[PDB]
């Protein structure tokens, strides 16, 4: 490409489709486009797993006491009722109030 070309072809817009097949420069630009995806895939996993571990380590002792109060290992009270409505989260569904609006 010629210097100072901002046109669609020079900067990587791909006109062809996978069925017809790419041109060479569109193929190289395409490889550049995929490399970022592979790199994101490889890099994100470590940070996600480490954040997961930190969350689990910080929360690990939180539980529902027989008072339904949510207390950590030290009996300090995080919440008086679980989820503030005191209900488990699996059995709920979405609803419409219909008195509102």
């Amino acid at each position: 490409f010629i210097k100072d070309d901002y046109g669609p072809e020079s900067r990587g817009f791909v006109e062809n489709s996978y069925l017809a097949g790419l041109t060479p420069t569109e193929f190289f630009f395409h490889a550049m486009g995929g490399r970022e995806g592979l790199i994101d895939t490889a890099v994100k996993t470590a940070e996600t797993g480490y954040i997961q571990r930190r969350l689990i380590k910080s929360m690990e002792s939180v539980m529902v006491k027989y008072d339904a109060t949510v207390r950590n290992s030290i009996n300090q009270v995080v919440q008086l009722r679980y989820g503030e409505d005191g209900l488990a989260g699996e059995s709920v569904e979405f609803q419409n109030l219909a008195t509102l609006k």
Binding site: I2, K3, D4, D5
Partner: protein, 114 residues
């Protein structure tokens, strides 16, 4: 505006107010040489730093195969049809997509921005 050097040790002069005659001077600190200030201006700073880049564009740029050229815009001096154009090619240009033109053909090197 510019810097001038001493005529004895070739060191950097500095501005000094003349207190008696109220005339600006430049006096080397490593000797006694003194010369009056002709320009009367010392420190100029352009914050917008607007500078015609026609001063920074070399005519040899007309020999580059990698640059685009058009026959639409003729030269002013020689009226040559080939004109090789390029953008600022500079960092901290503010925002300029303006095309700069350089005349091809030997030694003309005329530069007109449109």
């Amino acid at each position: 505006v510019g810097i001038r050097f001493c005529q004895e040790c070739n060191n950097m002069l500095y501005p000094k107010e003349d207190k008696e005659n109220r005339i600006l001077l430049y006096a080397c600190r490593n000797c006694d040489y003194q010369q009056e200030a002709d320009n009367s201006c010392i420190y100029v700073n352009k914050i917008t730093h607007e500078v015609d880049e026609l001063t920074q564009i070399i005519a040899d740029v007309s020999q580059d195969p990698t640059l685009p050229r058009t026959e639409d815009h003729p030269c002013q001096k020689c009226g040559h049809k080939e004109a090789v154009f390029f953008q600022s090619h500079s960092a901290r240009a503010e925002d300029a997509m303006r095309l700069y033109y350089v005349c091809t053909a030997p030694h003309c090197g005329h530069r007109w921005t449109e």
